[PDB]
Structure formats: structure tokens, C-alpha cells
Amino acid sequence: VPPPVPPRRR
Amino acid sequence: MEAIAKYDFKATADDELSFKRGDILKVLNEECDQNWYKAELNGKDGFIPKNYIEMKP
């Protein structure tokens, strides 16, 4: 199960 | 620089591009974000997440 993706645009 | 897809990734928007766990990416731009990278793949260029890849100088 891959990681939680980051919130884009900082 | 070189980049390495660590997990599968399916874009969310127009400024992002997909890959599949294993792609060799072309690291072009990088706005010093601490979560994304701008790289080249499959005839496109877009954002990809840092926790989904590993860099290789």
C-alpha cells in the first residue's frame, strides 16, 4: 500500500 | 539528475503526469518543494510526489 500523497502547492 | 519511481502513481491534474512503480524519470525543474518534483516521462513533463520516488545524483 503506497504512501499518502502530499498536499500540492506547499 | 535521475529519479526512480518507488510506487505506482496515477495523476490527479493537468500539471501532473503518471508513472508506474519502476519508471526512470528525467529530473528537469525542481522549485525546492519538499513534497514534489518536475520530471520527464513518456513524452510529457509534470509534477510527481517525493514520497513516491527516490532521487539518484
Question: CA-to-CA distance for B21 and B8, rounded, in angstroms?
Answer: 4
Q: Name the structure determination technique.
A: NMR
Question: Which amino acid type is present at position B9?
Answer: F
Residues 6+ apart with CB under 8 A from B17: B11, B41, B42, B44, B45, B46, B47, B48
- Chain A residues in contact with B13 by the CB 8 A cut-off are 8
Contact B36 A7 (CB under 8 A): no
Question: CA-to-CA distance for B38 and B51, rounded, in angstroms?
Answer: 14
Partner-chain residue, chosen from B7, B33, B36, that has the shortest CB–CB distance to A2: B7
What are B31-34's contacts with CB under 8 Å, separation 24+? Answer: B33/A10
Question: Which amino acid type is present at position B56?
Answer: K
- The SS3 assignment for B3 reads strand
- Chain A residues in contact with B8 by the CB 8 A cut-off are 2
- The SS3 assignment for A10 reads coil
Q: Show the domains of chain B with their CATH numbers.
A: 1-57 (2.30.30.40)
DSSP letter at A5 equals P
Phi, psi for B30 (deg, rounded to 5): -170, 105
Q: Taking a C-beta distance cutoff of 8 angstroms, is the pair B16, B50 a contact?
A: no
